[PDB]
Structure formats: C-alpha cells, structure tokens
Amino acid sequence: FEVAFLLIQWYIYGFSLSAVYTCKRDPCPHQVDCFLSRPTEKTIFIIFMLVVSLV
Amino acid sequence: FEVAFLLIQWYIYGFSLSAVYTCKRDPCPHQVDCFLSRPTEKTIFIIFMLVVSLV
C-alpha cells in the first residue's frame, strides 16, 4: 500500500507544486493561465510527507 | 493613388471582417480571443467602398 500510494502520488503530479499553471480545457478559450494558493508551503509539506512515507 | 491605396487596403487585412479575432500580444498571456463591434455591417460597407474605388 505504501509503495502503490507513493507511485500514484509521483505519477499524477510529481513531488512539487508550481506557482503558475497552464490550463487547456473546453470552457476556457485557447490556453489559459492560473495561479495556485501557496505553492512553496504546499511543496514543503509534500517533501515532509514523502520523507515520512519513505521512512 | 487609387491602385496603391487599394493594394494597401487588400494587403493589410483583405476585404472582410471576422466576428472573432485571435490576438497574440506581449501584455496578454498566451493567445487571447477578442470580438469586433459590428463585423457584418463593416464588411458590407467595405464592399461598397471597394466597388466604388474599382469603378
């Protein structure tokens, strides 16, 4: 379970969050730009959770 | 003068106006979409002016 959850967590989005996200969706015209809430703190907590899972 | 003005008028934008315009500019992020005021009436008047110039 640990290994599978870690693999899915890596596959979906990796191990970091970017401040700027490029979104291409049907309602949005052409290629729109969006921004995350607090990417750096979320990335830091991602790193702690990944380390805890590894340990 | 007639011929040169007609050639420039054709070269810059052609002889018709489209309701939807795709704009790519430095301030605008990615590729933005804009709309003209009254494209059909403007196109009709373009056709009259082109015909008058030709005559």
Curated annotation (Swiss-Prot), chains A, B:
Family listed: Belongs to the connexin family. Alpha-type (group II) subfamily.
Assembly and oligomerization: A connexon is composed of a hexamer of connexins. Interacts (via C-terminus) with TJP1. Interacts (via C-terminus) with SRC (via SH3 domain). Interacts (not ubiquitinated) with UBQLN4 (via UBA domain). Interacts with SGSM3 and CNST. Interacts with RIC1/CIP150. Interacts with CSNK1D. Interacts with NOV. Interacts with TMEM65. Interacts with ANK3/ANKG and PKP2.
GN (gene name): GJA1
Extracellular side: 13-43
The protein, known as: Gap junction alpha-1 protein
Known role: Gap junction protein that acts as a regulator of bladder capacity. A gap junction consists of a cluster of closely packed pairs of transmembrane channels, the connexons, through which materials of low MW diffuse from one cell to a neighboring cell. May play a critical role in the physiology of hearing by participating in the recycling of potassium to the cochlear endolymph. Negative regulator of bladder functional capacity: acts by enhancing intercellular electrical and chemical transmission, thus sensitizing bladder muscles to cholinergic neural stimuli and causing them to contract.
Cystine crosslinks: 23-34
Tissue: Expressed at intercalated disks in the heart (at protein level). Expressed in the fetal cochlea.
PTM comment, free text: Sumoylated with SUMO1, SUMO2 and SUMO3, which may regulate the level of functional Cx43 gap junctions at the plasma membrane. May be desumoylated by SENP1 or SENP2.
Subcellular location: Cell membrane; Cell junction, Gap junction; Endoplasmic reticulum
Organism listed in the record: Homo sapiens
Disease as annotated in the protein's UniProt record: Oculodentodigital dysplasia: A disease characterized by a typical facial appearance and variable involvement of the eyes, dentition, and fingers. Characteristic facial features include a narrow, pinched nose with hypoplastic alae nasi, prominent columella and thin anteverted nares together with a narrow nasal bridge, and prominent epicanthic folds giving the impression of hypertelorism. The teeth are usually small and carious. Typical eye findings include microphthalmia and microcornea.
